[model samples]
Target: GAGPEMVRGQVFDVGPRYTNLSYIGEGAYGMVCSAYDNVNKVRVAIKKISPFEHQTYCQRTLREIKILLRFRHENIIGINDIIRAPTIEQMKDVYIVQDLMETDLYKLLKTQHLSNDHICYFLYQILRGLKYIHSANVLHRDLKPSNLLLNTTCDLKICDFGLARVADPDHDHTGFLTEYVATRWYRAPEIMLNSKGYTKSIDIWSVGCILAEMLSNRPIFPGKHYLDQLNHILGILGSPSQEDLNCIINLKARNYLLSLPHKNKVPWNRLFPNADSKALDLLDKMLTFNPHKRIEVEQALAHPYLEQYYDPSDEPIAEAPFELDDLPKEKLKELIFEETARFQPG
Candidate 1:
């Protein structure tokens, strides 16, 4: 099962499949439908890939299925089955079966605003997922709100490993070009500057961007183009160092650099006016210009801002739904203390 032959349209009817009431969501590599698995007797998401689409996309679909089969975690989206649809004279499609998620973080952000506590919980789960992936030496190059799924319980699950790559243990080659990797707004500085041989830290930078977006209620770098994106990032975080400048020169946007000037200080307070100081502090560290200096996933998870509110043992207060201004500061303090007690020496 290495190439196209392993994938090429075949039929595997899993015990009388039935299409119950379902809705179609956004379509990318294929058409996604919310359906019910009659045999399994549960709701499932089915992404159908039509053969008419580019053949390379089918390869990516196969790759995603292959990678997901190896991953199973509380915070990672679970794939139930990979069903090969029968090729009909009318049409040919591949069906990928997965657990149906309530909604994606993108839709959530668009419909409802997130509180600091809510953001903390979601980001914590995201980091937990990333921790698992990094532990397995897998790099999720594409990490964004849209790619993150949320269940009815509000638990976050990382999905869409279309851009993921297995990092070479001996050499840091993840078989990815910097330009083709992360989303524009969430890209890391090293990626922006075209620095070769990136690692899992690229994903960390994306997480920081997502956290900032949650706090600000908008994208941190909502630029129209690569140059604009670079400018937007620099505008918030100040100027890049000499090394950064040199690296950027080699990038495709080097021609546009002449118009942009450097700033020295990041407008942290202005960017997140209502966010707590600890939260802003952690954001700054995670979004550092130097990838080498950028915070690691584990370190980001243990950050004071995140640790301040996370409760490993304390179950979420089910009676009251989470609200931004209504966060329990004292309870958060207690959680932080408990975290410290668990980590620190007696």
Candidate 2:
């Protein structure tokens, strides 16, 4: 069944399971395509990777799959199947099947104007994912809009766990885990400061940046690079408060923040003028300079901006998956081979 299937204007059809129709877009992993899922009588999304027998590719692929297998949130993407050649040589190709969506929030932002309800719903979905991911003691680390999927019905689903992390209180493997986390545009102050113990609040900061972007239709701090990002942040929001400053354990980082002349404390009205007051208030909480004081995902969900849509009864179940932080290459290879075999029924 895993044969030559090209997805262009219209390619080969694989009968009931999936009909390779057209290319959707590229992702952090591989090319995605629109296909027809025969059983459900609906279209589906397929993320395929022709990984060249390299162990790194196999390891990461399996790690991604293992992490994804643990998630079962409504706001997170639903994975249907993981199809690959059941043989060793044929294992060069792997197809990750997922629910097909209309478009991503990144592309949608360019073509549409978001109504207040649209903003509320979208942020709610993000928080919805964060709420679960954090509870599971995992950090998405990456939260840009392109990773946020949307359907024509306006449902939001978070996808891609290629860079996700699990918390391990016993050991601090953060720096060892990843040197680069979020995109420069959505990077948190704690990360910019290179704090050793930047926690889940880092993600909260990115959500705030996303909120501002949706409101203005542009990135709030469009910094060109690292220092440029800090400059954009300081130029707009001014310096971090001394209390916030004291929280940074790094001496050099504190000196750097102090050296920057901070005077451009733009008024919230000017920054978010036409936006709902409550929404701006939530944004303010999310972007606080002190990572410790930055609004937690739970608090933001309860904010007045999302009051009308908030459901108190709703609760998300998360998992603290076994730490796969720095698994050795050979072990990762063995795990993927077993995982690949599990997909094929005799």
Candidate 3:
């Protein structure tokens, strides 16, 4: 019997609990693989995080782990366990275990033809997950199709919280957000304008982009660069209102918007011909140019498009806001060790 083997001549050092490791692929974070969970009697995924590779990488690794620990929802990926390395001092990389899914939304969208109901259900799950994330005072700044994991049964779970940050109600999230955030196509207009700051509404803009992509089978705004990205957004969203234009903090960006030829808003029906009316309506609000005008996660969940999957009692909220205080490398390593120790096999 094929019981155990090295993945490309390298066995995962996750732990004795996981076996038959098969390398998945390397991501920006680190190496990932699917493995058999001996105790849980099912398949699982493990991400090898090399925190020491770079300072930012370490911080991202910690940030991702901290968020995954507290985020518990059906539509949000949950960490089954964090592998306890040989020991804290001896540990080289951290391994995080999660539910193994058939493929990510990006791959699924490319290979499969989804019905309207499938699109509705997928959007509903995304909104539901974001509702919980926002309720916990967090913003999943990266909500692209690639980060959304999908299973064979049509289940979708939001993953990749490395870019996420706790929301600020003070109307300014400028500093921390300056780091590379959302992908070009899904980035909110307010973010590109470098406005006074941005908010959770940015996430809604990404959801809108994803919705359109799923319906159209391609990225609505496949910008070649950042400026082109804004152009693509404005081309369809139309020119922003003077009030919205004034919100842009960057003078050059503001002037750029004013200089562009006036473009009228495109009808949703025309862009996504034969798309469901309710879906189009929700998409309209989610893609609003003004961040303040974007549909909030809870409101979008209640929209008639996702009405079929909406269940008040089923949507769970985090009990408290997640606190992620900055720590030095040594402290972060210890915290990572403690988090991994939280795993208890059945």
Candidate 4:
């Protein structure tokens, strides 16, 4: 395994093909570096993660690589064609090469307001990546503005799949695997209420929050805790109907919901006065309280909200042969190493 201490100026160059340029940022379990891929004649983001750090880290990284390898979309940040180390013996650390972006949406939002075109284009790429991810029965679980990497020219690629989960289409309807995993401000109602029957719609809900943030340059519902977050959503989206309330089988959450006031929905235009009806309409659908009724990725791409930029070919038509089920930690790690080798030339 690589040393835990990472120097600021450390360079891990693998011949002329890949050369680490500088430190970019640090992800959950690794260091990010901006590197020049001489073969591709482009700068790329390299995430050097120590998969042997711990069992949990290993599992998540392995799962992330598996999902990424199966992905074939322009918006998703698939691994590039080379890596630092390949063999289990020489592989002290693994390097994931990705397309470099100028900045993340978070920092961009903090600095300046995004124009309508920027908003739509960013949302389009997000949906495009999510569509592909969902088609393969996976949930990103974490979709904050920071996770959406963006170039200055409006190119966005979905990254940081460390917390993603492969969904079970035949969901037992009694599992709430992502209740506390997603960020509080961007989490969906189903996840906050801890619903067992949650689906990929939870991701769509996060997209709604992200869209709102992009348009207004602030989080739509910035709450302190889950209960406060629930209230924030309730105050904005209105209290759930009794039928929707029934979806929350969790005793504590149900009781808390019953204690809340009878609030009416706030108009999206009221919150985002400058945003056009098209953006507002899509935000409304994506923020639906009932997960089953939320706007799907494909439907979102086809919405009149993004007609000018929507490309039909961007939507994935079929599921890839990616399955992350039943694999133990060791097997998953081996699989990651196996696929990592494919990216390097023999």
Model 3 ranges off by over 4 Å: 1-5, 169-179, 196-198, 323-327, 344-346
Better of 1 and 2 by TM-score: 2
Candidate 2 lDDT, 101-195, residue by residue in tens: 88988898888889988999999989988888888888777888888999989999988776666754344323211345458888876666754
Candidate closer to the true structure by lDDT (higher is better), 1 or 3: 3
Q: Is candidate 2 or candidate 3 better by TM-score?
A: 3
Worst 10 residues of 2 by lDDT: 169-178
Highest lDDT model number: 3
lDDT of 1 by residue, 1-346 (tens): 1132211243322223635535455456755666667778887887765533444454455446656766777788877755542323333445667788889888888888888888888888888888777877677888989999988989888998766766543444222134543578887755545553237777888888898888876988887875567678878777666775564544444544544675767678886889878878888888988776788877777788777645544322112110011224334323223322321224
Q: Where's the lowest-lDDT run of ten residues in candidate 3?
A: 172-181
Which rank order by lDDT, best down to worst?
3, 4, 2, 1
Candidate 4 C-alpha error for residue 178, in Å: 8.3
lDDT of 1: 0.66
Instruction: Give the CA lDDT, 0 to 100, for residue 43 in model 1.
Output: 77
Q: For candidate 4, lDDT tens digit of each residue in 1-346?
A: 2333344755454445655467767756778777677877898887777776466777777777877877877777777754646566666677777888899889988999888888888898899888888887778878998988888677888887877886754652443333465688987776656653236887898899999999899999999976678778998999889998797676776777898878999999989999979999999999999887889988999999889878877576446644343556566667668867776667
* RMSD after Cα superposition, model 4: 3.4
Show pairs that collide, candidate 1. none
Instruction: Find the 10 residues in a row with the least total lDDT in model 4.
Output: 172-181
The alpha-carbon RMSD values of the candidates against the true structure, listed in the order shown, are 14.4, 3.1, 2.8, 3.4
Rank candidates by TM-score, best first: 3, 2, 4, 1
